[PDB]
Design a protein around this ligand. Structure first.
Ligand SMILES: [Zn+2]
Lengths: 249, 73, 48, 61
RNA sequence: AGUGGAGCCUGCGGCUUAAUUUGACUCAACACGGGAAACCUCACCCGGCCCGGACACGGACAGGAUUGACAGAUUGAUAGCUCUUUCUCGAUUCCGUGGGUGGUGGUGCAUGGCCGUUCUAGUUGGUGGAGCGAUUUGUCUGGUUAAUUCCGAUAACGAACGAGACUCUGGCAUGCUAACUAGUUACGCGACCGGUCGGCGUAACUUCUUAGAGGGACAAGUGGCGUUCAGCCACCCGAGAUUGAGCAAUAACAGGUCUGUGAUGCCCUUAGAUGUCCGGGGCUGCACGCGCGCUACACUGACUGGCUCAGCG
């Protein structure tokens, strides 16, 4: 009716947005009942990068973790993948949006990180750009470990182990079941004939560099079996060094 | 390679604007009687979702809730 | 669930994994009229 | 002159702040540093006194 | 036919200016960046807010760290990135000090894929022969060709690569295949003075239009010149006797190109390898040179009315 004329107007605002106070109709989108119909009129694919940051800034604050997750999954995350493929580097506002998306870590992990690695088509460049934001923003220990467990159980790709390393790089105290998944993750390549990248060894390095205190003799010697079958001229002696100078409990 | 010198220069960004810390704002909401009766000073918001607990701000003339953006006279 | 485990000493937190993997109008008309009110005040063409 | 060996001289000043266009013999690296040398003649301080105090016996610290 | 002379427009110098962003300077410098710049483009200038990692140390927080926020008042801006309002939001921490082990970095090399530049006719083996060897022969007396082309001679014989060849295109068809988004002719009805009608309605099938197949030119034929051969010149008939393009996927590049990998080498990261945005300017500024253009300098013209014809798109 008349509401369709209001949002078709703001469609032409958000497509040419750069700065300033947004129209008040846009700021009350997650308060609506039929919000997904409204969002399609505004045309999220035709939006400017600057608009995308303030769009994310709205959804992260207005509660509802389930409503927040589905915005990232349908609008935000495709746009990130669209620009890394096109411009090869990410836009500033689009980057700033992702840091603002971490105000709800539950909706972040279930909407951005986990769906990205599950697709399989995730490139190395895509992984580092998003993964650096994990290093910048502090994440709750419960949510940090929960994302870490999924990636450990997940199918292996080059992009996948980058995230896993950066989560261990945070150096939080870990739940014990997560450690069991991480050991089982790396020991899954013990019989593998495939040539493993350097980023894989660095992930195994960071695991032993920090969490050598929480490794029992059973899994500790299972790791020494892993390096004996899948070696590296540079990094494998360092992991061998870190295991031999480890004090348990 | 030929190393760059690195210059000094001091400009103070130590002075930066931070909003004022209001200490213990819970006592302003309720006035407790000597017997044990609870009296609410501020208007409680009767919105869709933010009911029973969320108060409205006391403007010089009107009332304003801080979650749903409800305004009065 | 794995084989080789924690073995010895301390269990501080139990951890909740069963939420992550196990997952997968009057006011509107007021804002609408406020939008047109603003889109009129941007170009005045009248006042003295 | 230039750390990577280029010999140039200033052309125009542009900004109200200290910005200048500068000609060079070759193309400069981005990793480079431009630098000019200024010279003045310096003469010593007149601090002559023939009197010098007697030192105590020298030792190692 | 001009330009160079004139006015104007634009380019490059130069000159100004806060800025008048910019590589190239006798072809490949010179309306090249598709560059017709009010904004964006914009790289340039004058201003103004905003925040700028991880790490270690010292401080604050559940007696809220912090986020988000209606209206009003501020400066060049509807700045919740300030105050009245402090109302919500529950750790998603931020307040000072630093020391190297900073990465949406920059550049250099090893290596993995892919371009452009000069002419446009050559380039390069293999095997054999000649020389101690550098080297030579092949790659040549002669004629001939755009040509290491061809005839042919022969201590050479054979190749590969490109040019050539391949493909398209255009010229030609009153032969053929068709065309309700092409057109004609004839026939009806109508309008007009036996004719004119881009008026309207289906029997004629391709002349025009289209888009396909098949033809058609091969030095075919004749004459002259030619070691009587390779070839060259002239001429009849013919639409065409010497169409133009791509392919064709060379030689030299020490010009290289690109989100490929190297726990790659260095340099930088409150000196952000152009930080995002906000407002206003500048790119046009003008004594002058050097230049491409447009309009002109009239009578073969200008003005005025009338008349009638395209094609790429
Ligand atoms: Zn509210």
């Amino acid at each position: 009716p008349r509401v369709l004329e209001v949002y078709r107007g703001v469609r032409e605002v958000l497509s040419k947005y750069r700065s300033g106070k947004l129209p008040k109709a846009f700021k009350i989108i997650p308060a609506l009942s039929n919000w997904e119909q409204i969002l399609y009129v505004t045309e999220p694919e035709a939006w400017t990068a600057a608009a995308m940051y303030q769009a994310t800034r709205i959804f992260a604050s207005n509660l509802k973790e389930r409503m927040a997750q589905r915005f990232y999954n349908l609008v935000l995350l495709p746009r990130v993948r669209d620009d890394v493929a096109e411009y090869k580097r990410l836009n500033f506002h689009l980057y700033m949006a992702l840091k603002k998306a971490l105000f709800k870590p539950g909706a972040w992990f279930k909407g951005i990180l986990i769906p990205l690695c599950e697709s399989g088509t995730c490139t190395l460049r895509e992984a580092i750009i998003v993964g650096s934001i994990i290093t910048k923003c502090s994440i709750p220990v419960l949510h940090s470990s929960a994302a870490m467990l999924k990636i450990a159980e997940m199918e292996y790709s080059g992009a996948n182990s980058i995230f896993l390393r950066l989560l261990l790089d945070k150096k939080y105290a870990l739940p014990y079941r997560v450690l069991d998944a991480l050991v089982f993750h790396f020991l899954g390549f013990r019989t593998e004939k495939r040539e493993l990248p350097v980023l894989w060894h660095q992930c195994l390095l960071t695991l032993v560099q920090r969490y050598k205190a929480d490794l029992a003799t059973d899994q500790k010697e299972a790791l020494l079996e892993l390096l004996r079958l899948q070696p590296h001229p540079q990094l494998s002696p360092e992991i061998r060094r870190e295991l031999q100078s480890a004090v348990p409990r | 390679a030929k190393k760059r010198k690195k210059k000094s220069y001091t400009t103070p960004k130590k002075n930066k604007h931070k909003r004022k810390k209001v200490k213990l704002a819970v006592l302003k909401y309720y006035k407790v009687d000597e017997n044990g009766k609870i009296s609410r000073l501020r208007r409680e918001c009767p919105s869709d979702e933010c009911g029973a607990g969320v108060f409205m701000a006391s403007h010089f003339d009107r009332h304003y809730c801080g979650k749903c953006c409800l305004t009065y006279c | 669930s794995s084989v080789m485990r924690r073995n010895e000493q301390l269990t501080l937190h139990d951890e909740r994994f069963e939420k992550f993997y196990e997952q997968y109008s009057n006011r509107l008309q007021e804002v609408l009229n406020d939008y047109y009110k603003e889109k009129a005040e941007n170009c005045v063409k009248l006042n003295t | 002159r230039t750390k990577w060996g280029r010999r140039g001289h200033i052309k125009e000043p542009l900004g109200t702040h200290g910005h200048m266009k500068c000609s060079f013999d070759g193309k400069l690296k981005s990793q480079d540093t431009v630098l000019m040398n200024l010279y003045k003649r310096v003469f010593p301080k007149w601090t002559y006194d023939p009197y010098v105090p007697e030192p105590v016996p020298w030792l190692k610290s």
